[PDB]
Amino acid sequence: MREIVHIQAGQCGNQIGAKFWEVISDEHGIDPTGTYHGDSDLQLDRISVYYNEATGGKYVPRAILVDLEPGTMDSVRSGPFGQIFRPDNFVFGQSGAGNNWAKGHYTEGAELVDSVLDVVRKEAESCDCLQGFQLTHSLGGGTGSGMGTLLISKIREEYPDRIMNTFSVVPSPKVSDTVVEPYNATLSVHQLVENTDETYCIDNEALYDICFRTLKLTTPTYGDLNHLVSATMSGVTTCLRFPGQLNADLRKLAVNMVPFPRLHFFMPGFAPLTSRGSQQYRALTVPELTQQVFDAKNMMAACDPRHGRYLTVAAVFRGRMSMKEVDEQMLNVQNKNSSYFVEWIPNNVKTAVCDIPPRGLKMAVTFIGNSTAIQELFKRISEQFTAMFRRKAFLHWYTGEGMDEMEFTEAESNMNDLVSEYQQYQ
Amino acid sequence: MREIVHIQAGQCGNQIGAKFWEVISDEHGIDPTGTYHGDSDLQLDRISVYYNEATGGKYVPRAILVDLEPGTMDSVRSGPFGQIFRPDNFVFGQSGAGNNWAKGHYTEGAELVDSVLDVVRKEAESCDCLQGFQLTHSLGGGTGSGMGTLLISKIREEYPDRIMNTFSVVPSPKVSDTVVEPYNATLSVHQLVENTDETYCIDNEALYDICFRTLKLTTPTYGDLNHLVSATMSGVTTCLRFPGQLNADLRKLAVNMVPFPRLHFFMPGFAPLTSRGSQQYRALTVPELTQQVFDAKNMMAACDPRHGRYLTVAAVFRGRMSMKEVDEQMLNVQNKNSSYFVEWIPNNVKTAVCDIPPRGLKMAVTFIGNSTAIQELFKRISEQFTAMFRRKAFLHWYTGEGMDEMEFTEAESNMNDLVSEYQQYQ
Amino acid sequence: MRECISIHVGQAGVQIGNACWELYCLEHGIQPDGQMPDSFNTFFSETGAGKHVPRAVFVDLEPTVIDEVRTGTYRQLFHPEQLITGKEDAANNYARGHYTIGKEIIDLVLDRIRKLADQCTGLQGFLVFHSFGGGTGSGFTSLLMERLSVDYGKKSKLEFSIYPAPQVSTAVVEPYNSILTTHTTLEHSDCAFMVDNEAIYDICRRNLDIERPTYTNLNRLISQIVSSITASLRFDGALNVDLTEFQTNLVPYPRIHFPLATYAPVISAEKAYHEQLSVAEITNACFEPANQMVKCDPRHGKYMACCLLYRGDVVPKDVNAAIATIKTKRSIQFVDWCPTGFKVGINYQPPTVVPGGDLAKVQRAVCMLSNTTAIAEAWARLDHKFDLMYAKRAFVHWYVGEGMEEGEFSEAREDMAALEKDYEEVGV
Ligand SMILES: Nc1nc2c(ncn2[C@@H]2O[C@H](COP(=O)(O)CP(=O)(O)OP(=O)(O)O)[C@@H](O)[C@H]2O)c(=O)[nH]1
Ligand SMILES: Nc1nc2c(ncn2[C@@H]2O[C@H](COP(=O)(O)CP(=O)(O)OP(=O)(O)O)[C@@H](O)[C@H]2O)c(=O)[nH]1
Ligand SMILES: Nc1nc2c(ncn2[C@@H]2O[C@H](COP(=O)(O)OP(=O)(O)OP(=O)(O)O)[C@@H](O)[C@H]2O)c(=O)[nH]1
Ligand SMILES: [Mg+2]
Ligand SMILES: [Mg+2]
Ligand SMILES: [Mg+2]
């Protein structure tokens, strides 16, 4: 009962999934072949939500892997828990986007999507009652953006009554991978406004910061980042997969943290984050967990959260905790930061508690916030777009796929409007 | 309940802390890892005031270590009980003052302070009810003076209702380390007048004297000095950390020994001080302890105390003592020295008794006095400043950081005024 | 049927109180557990079946002195509802205890008091132990005293206060503290008894032959004295002196209600064998200038009234003789308007002695609480001390910081001055 099939796209998204899946397997106790070796009985009662029980007791991941080139799918098979995945579910093309959303969304992706649109249906049929789809991709390039975007809107025609999650990675100003980020972002966001129910905007610039100072890691890699990001995902859907004193599923969360139709972009956060040095000396108790969580530099979105107010705020705690300890801390925080919470929505807090913790750690906190400080993330992008679009630069790649210069300004306008919605209520 | 976070600064202050912390650990029974090995149960009931109880029974020091260079922090880690300190709390810059208060207070220190101003807040939050901050630094150079001074005033904005201690080391005429002592002292003292509640003025010239004659040590080092100085610190806060027949905390002491707003500079003293020879033959009884304590040459401030009168006088005794023995001695002393106590504040004495002594010694006495003989310490400094400032010598280092020649005379005037306040009531 | 509520304020009150409690326990044959292996009904209430809890409330602004009781031998005698604890201390200041910190704790305690007070039926009166020189013992007490006149009023109150010494005093700002806290004492407190540490010390040295006394020796001494007040209630002698009766007797005027105590005999274990303790001798001992509890001069003073309370082996036949003898003597003298000036109490029960006690086990004992013009001179020097301190605004800024207006000082000094003349007026 209550199943969620997972979708993946892009070079980064796929990688994230690869780690995320592994982590989830570890949490339940699934091995590379698929046979169960775990001891705790409650891992097997909600195994059905993320694993179909196949023949011979070998569980399989309910997933769809998409790409416009075959390069990334090579390393996913050879790595750990690549053998658990079903051969049928891998989808891939021979062309590739080439860091262009125009090629990705119309010409290249629309030929590949019809295979996936048939594959997902089967998955849907398989489970008793599907409650929502998780989606993992990037907005920086053309492959993860153009394809995923194309897909997500066509799901709303067949399944209008289901919740829609999207785990994205938006561009940073300092750590700029590609040149045409402003373009891709500007166009890819447009469709994610009306079609999605919730979106987690992650940024690598913040991740790096988190890594250097807090974890004290001398040589970070992308692997670390993947591990981090996956943790967040694990956190949000913990209440479905395990019992608890106060359970909070996805729909509930959505209802609580999305007050208005067009303002649903969130910012993830994770705690506790401890190095080898801070593992010994940091006293892991609820208050400690709390304070760390609300720090500006501990966020995964590279902004200044204290420029504006949080519209809503929710948290998902794990491991056994006393509720007077838990529920008081939030209140205290609110009291402290009376200038950093919206006044006309009194009592902004939402809490959730799980009995089964992460293996090794005693407690954990996943922070999902909704703020007016997302303006800083978009504003810069808008500016960049303006700078680019003024001279019609890098345009012949997009215009070659049959896109008018008006069609840029149509999405641009929408983006602007969206941005304004935050500054309406700030 | 009732916690005190410790701050450190400068090359000397840090060193002092390093020893002080060790001594305090020894007193309670904390080991290099942090796990408790002690036997006496009363060490664990007031452990909370100087040690946060972290995970796994490993206690950690509530401290902040500050410096403008990374050199001094190397030897603190490698020494004894360097492993007890938390990695998070160490703060350090890459620039350095260069024995200049102008560079230290405005340009160099103000960039570093914003890290500490965030770190202290966390510490404050952690404890239930903080009662005051201890601070350890020097006024001779620019690093310990400029930074600490900068810090201490900004604490009064956030925490106006808390007691403020400062353990300084003022310059001597004979043992002159740097050339620009008069300058630094003149400017650093100005801010310590209005911002502090109490200050202990220590001088190395007296320490040396104490060492050569009393302790009969053939080869003194700075280590010995550190050990000595730390003892005083241990003495003042003994009543908080252990039970007693007549307890006296910091606030009480402050109330008793600071009659007027601007006259709060004290002079520390310690007893009994015994060599290997005098350990056997000196009869350690209360009267003996008393007489030694009031000697002019036994003080830590290099002055002549008998030039003027003590405005107030307090003492903190340790170990079990009969009160008729204790309270009589002081009275007797007063009777004897009727020309060396102020007449219009009759009954100048304050006493405090602790049941838990220092390990090894049977009894101990910490002498905190307030006198008009602090004029001799400042007068010389003033003279030196005058000598220097007449020809505008060593000025281009200070003027380079944007300080007018009027700004020297503004502080100078204040200093003069302060000096006069002693000669008003002498 | 009869009952009385004890209150303990500040560190001093706590410290004193423990000893008293111990003494009480010893008296009625109760171990620290609270189960006895009637007379004790006044101070102890029997909970369920064999659990004797005391009529007590310990107030303190620190945790140190109260947690001393919670960890020791008498952990079983009390529970955390009875033992109230603050956070920030009084810090040897009247202003901190009364205005700033005093609002929060008093509220908690009043309810507790009510809970304790309404449980018992026969309320005789209150007892409040503190020190004038102490921070909590001055600032809180004044507040507390003020509060207690609202709920009760006519129901009696007593307080055994540690008066400051001119020579041997262990704090600098004590003068101020005394002057302020006496403003509330005159209006609210029905009769306050006064003891000085210096006086005690001399006694300890000379008679007990212990040249190294500490607070534990003084506390014990005090406890005996305290017992000697309440001994009439708990035991049935041939003649009895209740608290109300005592009040009626000793206190003549509205302004004057400051008698001083004395206790005798107090002697060593070896000295008891030689010294034949007679009644007359013990009577004399109470009137000697050496054995007084306050630094005073009985030679200058005149006794308006004084209440003798005997316990042990005593009968009225020689008591009368003793009384007569004192009257006959002219070294002791009275005021013209009071021809008959004694109130005499008797008790069969002998005064107990503590395990490892400094005092010797004796048959007889006496306690005289004398109202006199001797203690009138004691504040003349206090005022002088205070005045000098005030004259140059010494230590004032701290007080000001805690919300004390400057006119308060003016109010308290003038009043004190006025009071000093009252004694003179009475004694003319
Ligand atoms: N957290 C992680 N972020 C990554 C990783 N690899 C890339 N990135 C970030 O994602 C951005 C690039 O995303 P993609 O390579 O997936 C662009 P896309 O695949 O959609 O198009 P093509 O590259 O044309 O196939 C870039 O700004 C990086 O900072 C990774 O392994 N982990
Ligand atoms: N008691 C001690 N006194 C010391 C010690 N080291 C130096 N000193 C005294 O302190 C004075 C120098 O103080 P500092 O070196 O801390 C000057 P500061 O660090 O604030 O500036 P920089 O040297 O430019 O970093 C000098 O007059 C010495 O007599 C020590 O280990 N113990
Ligand atoms: N006789 C006697 N006197 C005491 C004792 N303890 C304290 N004192 C006296 O009381 C005065 C100090 O008052 P405290 O009770 O310590 O002060 P406080 O009211 O508790 O205020 P804080 O100390 O700030 O909590 C001194 O002058 C002492 O001489 C005791 O056990 N016996
Ligand atoms: Mg790709
Ligand atoms: Mg230095
Ligand atoms: Mg106290």
- The three state secondary structure string of B18-40 is HHHHHHHHHHHCECCCCEECCCC
How many CA within 13 A on the CB side of residue A172? 17
| Residue given tokens 């106006």 in the structure block | B160
Cα-Cα-Cα-Cα dihedral sign, residues B40, B46, B51, B55: positive
Residues, CB-to-ion distance under 5 Å, ligand 5: B 11, 143
Q: Which ligand 2 atom is at minimum distance from the Cα of B146? A: 20
Is residue B189 within 8 A of residue B415, CB to CB? The reply is yes
- CA nearest B169: which of B398, B387, B11, B389? B11
How many CA within 13 A on the CB side of residue C12? 26
Q: Which domains does chain B have, with CATH numbers?
A: 1-259 (3.40.50.1440), 260-373 (3.30.1330.20), 374-426 (1.10.287.600)
Q: Is the peptide bond before B272 cis (omega within 30 degrees of 0)?
A: yes
Is residue C144 within 8 A of residue C110, CB to CB? The reply is no
The 10 Å Cβ neighbour count of residue A45 is 10
- Which pair of tokens denotes residue B25? 């650990």
Q: Compute φ and ψ for C161, nearest 5 degrees.
A: -100, 140
Closest ligand to C-alpha of residue C131 is 3
Strands B163-169 and B132-136: parallel
The 10 Å Cβ neighbour count of residue A71 is 11
How far is it, in rounded angstroms, from Cα A230 to Cα B178?
Answer: 57
Which one is catalytic: C46, C245, C281, C402? Answer: C245
Closest ligand to C-alpha of residue A172 is 1
Is residue A167 within 8 A of residue A19, CB to CB? The reply is no
Q: What is the DSSP letter of B401?
A: T
How far is it, in rounded angstroms, from Cα A107 to Cα A104?
Answer: 6
Which of the listed residues B163, B245, B246 should we mutate to test ligand 3's pocket, taking the one with most ligand atoms within 8 A of CB?
A: B246
| Residue given tokens 């011979």 in the structure block | A56
Is residue B350 within 8 A of residue B248, CB to CB? The reply is yes
Strands C122-131 and C2-9: parallel
Contact B327 C168 (CB under 8 A): yes
Q: Compute φ and ψ for C126, nearest 5 degrees.
A: -95, 155
CATH of domain C375-428: 1.10.287.600
User: If you write DSSP's letter for every residue of A9-25 in order, what string do you get?
Assistant: -SHHHHHHHHHHHHHHH
A278 touches chain B (CB under 8 A): yes
How many CA within 13 A on the CB side of residue A158? 15
Is residue B15 within 8 A of residue B221, CB to CB? The reply is no
Cβ neighbors of B267 (< 8 A, separation 6 or more) are B200, B201, B299, B300, B301, B303, B305, B368, B369, B370, B371, B374
- CA nearest C116: which of C92, C81, C164, C148? C81
How far is it, in rounded angstroms, from Cα A84 to Cα A52?
Answer: 12
| Residue given tokens 């001891």 in the structure block | A39
- Which pair of tokens denotes residue A34? 């698929």
CATH topology of domain C1-259: Rossmann fold (3.40.50)
- In angstroms, the Cα distances linking C344 to B143, B328, C3, C183, C330 are 77, 38, 23, 32, 21
Domain residue extents for chain C: 1-259, 260-374, 375-428
Strand partners, C367: C263
Nearest chain B residue to A288, by CA: B126
How far is it, in rounded angstroms, from Cα C410 to Cα A140?
Answer: 78
Q: Which ligand 1 atom is at minimum distance from the Cα of A97? A: 24
Q: Order of strands across the sheet with C342-345?
A: C263-264, C366-372, C303-309, C342-345
How far is it, in rounded angstroms, from Cα C124 to Cα A289?
Answer: 55
How many CA within 13 A on the CB side of residue B143? 23
How far is it, in rounded angstroms, from Cα B305 to Cα B267?
Answer: 10
Is residue C15 within 8 A of residue C137, CB to CB? The reply is no
How far is it, in rounded angstroms, from Cα C117 to Cα C3?
Answer: 9
What CATH superfamily classification does C260-374 receive? Answer: Tubulin/FtsZ, C-terminal domain (3.30.1330.20)
Nearest chain B residue to A276, by CA: B87
Q: Is A204 annotated as a binding residue?
A: yes
In chain B, the N- to C-terminal Cα span, in Å, equals 41
Q: Helices B375-390 and B405-425, interaxial angle, to 10°?
A: 150
- In angstroms, the Cα distances linking C400 to A158, B157, B160, C93 are 76, 20, 16, 11
The 10 Å Cβ neighbour count of residue C6 is 23
Q: Do chains A and C touch (3 or more CB pairs under 8 A)?
A: no
How far is it, in rounded angstroms, from Cα B17 to Cα C349?
Answer: 62
How far is it, in rounded angstroms, from Cα B23 to Cα B3?
Answer: 18
How far is it, in rounded angstroms, from Cα B223 to Cα C332?
Answer: 68
User: Which of C67, C207, C208, C395 best tests the B interface by mutation, with the highest count of B CBs <10 A?
Assistant: C395
- In angstroms, the Cα distances linking A195 to A165, A418, B1, B417, C428 are 10, 14, 54, 74, 103
The 10 Å Cβ neighbour count of residue A194 is 11
For residue B259, list chain C residues with Cβ-Cβ distance below 8 A: 394-395
C264-276 as b/e: b if 16+ CB within 10 A = bbbbeeeebeeee
Nearest chain C residue to B328, by CA: C168
The rounded Cα B367 to chain-centroid distance in angstroms is: 13
Intrachain domains C1-259 and C375-428 with the same fold: no
What residue owns the CA closest to ligand 1's atom 28? Answer: A177
For residue B345, list chain C residues with Cβ-Cβ distance below 8 A: 172, 388-389, 394
For residue B314, list chain C residues with Cβ-Cβ distance below 8 A: 172
How far is it, in rounded angstroms, from Cα A49 to Cα B393?
Answer: 80
Is residue A235 within 8 A of residue A248, CB to CB? The reply is no
How far is it, in rounded angstroms, from Cα B240 to Cα B112?
Answer: 32
3-state secondary structure B70-129: CCHHHHHHHCCCCCCCCHHHECCCCCCCCCCHHHHHHHHHHHHHHHHHHHHHHHHHHCCC
Which 3 state secondary structure label does DSSP give A58?
strand
How far is it, in rounded angstroms, from Cα A201 to Cα A197?
Answer: 13
User: Which of A281, A335, A362 best tests the B interface by mutation, with the highest count of B CBs <10 A?
Assistant: A281
B53 touches chain A (CB under 8 A): yes
The 10 Å Cβ neighbour count of residue A302 is 23
How far is it, in rounded angstroms, from Cα A191 to Cα A152?
Answer: 9
- Which pair of tokens denotes residue A82? 């690549």
User: Which of B252, B329, B341 best tests the C interface by mutation, with the highest count of C CBs <10 A?
Assistant: B252
A222 lines ligand 1 (CB under 6 A): yes
B206 lines ligand 2 (CB under 6 A): no
How many CA within 13 A on the CB side of residue A368? 27
What residue owns the CA closest to ligand 2's atom 15? Answer: B11
- Alpha helices for B134-180 (secondary structure H): 143-158
Q: How many residues does chain A have?
A: 426
Q: Compute φ and ψ for A201, nearest 5 degrees.
A: -90, 100
How far is it, in rounded angstroms, from Cα B273 to Cα B292?
Answer: 9
Strands A59-61 and A198-202: unpaired
In chain C, the N- to C-terminal Cα span, in Å, equals 44
Please, which residues 11-30 of chain C have a Cβ atom closer than 8 Å to chain B? 11, 15
Closest ligand to C-alpha of residue B243 is 6
Is residue B148 within 8 A of residue B135, CB to CB? The reply is yes
Is residue B261 within 8 A of residue C397, CB to CB? The reply is yes
Cβ neighbors of C102 (< 8 A, separation 6 or more) are C139, C140, C143
The 10 Å Cβ neighbour count of residue C288 is 11
How far is it, in rounded angstroms, from Cα B371 to Cα B267?
Answer: 8
| Residue given tokens 């009954």 in the structure block | B347
What residue owns the CA closest to ligand 3's atom 27? Answer: C170
A426 touches chain B (CB under 8 A): no
How many CA within 13 A on the CB side of residue A22? 19
Is residue A133 within 8 A of residue A182, CB to CB? The reply is no
Is residue C379 within 8 A of residue C198, CB to CB? The reply is no
How far is it, in rounded angstroms, from Cα B242 to Cα B355?
Answer: 8
The rounded Cα C114 to chain-centroid distance in angstroms is: 23
Is residue A277 within 8 A of residue B87, CB to CB? The reply is yes
What residue owns the CA closest to ligand 3's atom 14? Answer: C134
Closest ligand to C-alpha of residue A8 is 1
- Torsion region of B216: left, alpha or beta (phi above 0 gives left; psi -120 to 50 gives alpha): left
Distance from CA of A167 to the nearest CA of B (A): 32
- The experimental method behind these coordinates is cryo-EM
Distance from CA of A377 to the nearest CA of B (A): 25
C354-365 as b/e: b if 16+ CB within 10 A = eeeebbbebebb
Contact B347 C398 (CB under 8 A): no
**How many A from CA of C128 to the centre of ligand 6?**
16
Which 3 state secondary structure label does DSSP give A357?
coil
User: If you write DSSP's letter for every residue of A247-304 in order, what string do you get?
Assistant: ---HHHHHHHH--SSS--EEEEEEE----TTHHHHS---HHHHHHHHT-STTBSS-S-
- DSSP-based helix, strand, coil % in chain B, nearest 5: 45, 15, 35
| Residue given tokens 């600071």 in the structure block | B258
Q: Is the peptide bond before A272 cis (omega within 30 degrees of 0)?
A: yes
How far is it, in rounded angstroms, from Cα B84 to Cα A281?
Answer: 9
Active site residue C245: yes
Distance from CA of B32 to the nearest CA of C (A): 29
Task: List, as own/partner pairs, every contact residues A251-254 make where C-beta atoms lie below 8 angstroms and the sequence separation is at least 24, other chains included.
Answer: A251/A131, A251/A132, A251/A163, A253/A198, A253/A314, A253/A350, A253/A352, A253/A368, A254/A163, A254/A197, A254/A198
B148 lines ligand 2 (CB under 6 A): no
For residue B34, list chain A residues with Cβ-Cβ distance below 8 A: 280-281
Q: What is the DSSP letter of A392?
A: T
3-state secondary structure chain C: CEEEEEEEEHHHHHHHHHHHHHHHHHHHCCCCCCCCCCHHHCCEEECCCCCEEECCCEECCCCHHHHHHHHCHHHHCCCCCCECCCCCCCCCCHHHHHHHCHHHHHHHHHHHHHHHHHHCCEEEEEEEEEECCCCHHHHHHHHHHHHHHHHCCCCEEEEEEEECCCCCCCCCCHHHHHHHHHHHHHHCCCEEEEEEHHHHHHHHHHCCCCCCCCHHHHHHHHHHHHHHHHHHHHCCCCCCCCHHHHHHHHCCCCCCCCCECEEECCCCCCHHHHCCCCHHHHHHHHHCCCCECCCCCCCCCCEEEEEEECECCCCHHHHHHHHHHHHHCCCCCECCCCCCCEEEECCCCCCCCCCCCCCCCCCCEEEEEEEECCCCCHHHHHHHHHHHHHHCCCCHHHHHHCCCCCHHHHHHHHHHHHHHHHHHHHHC
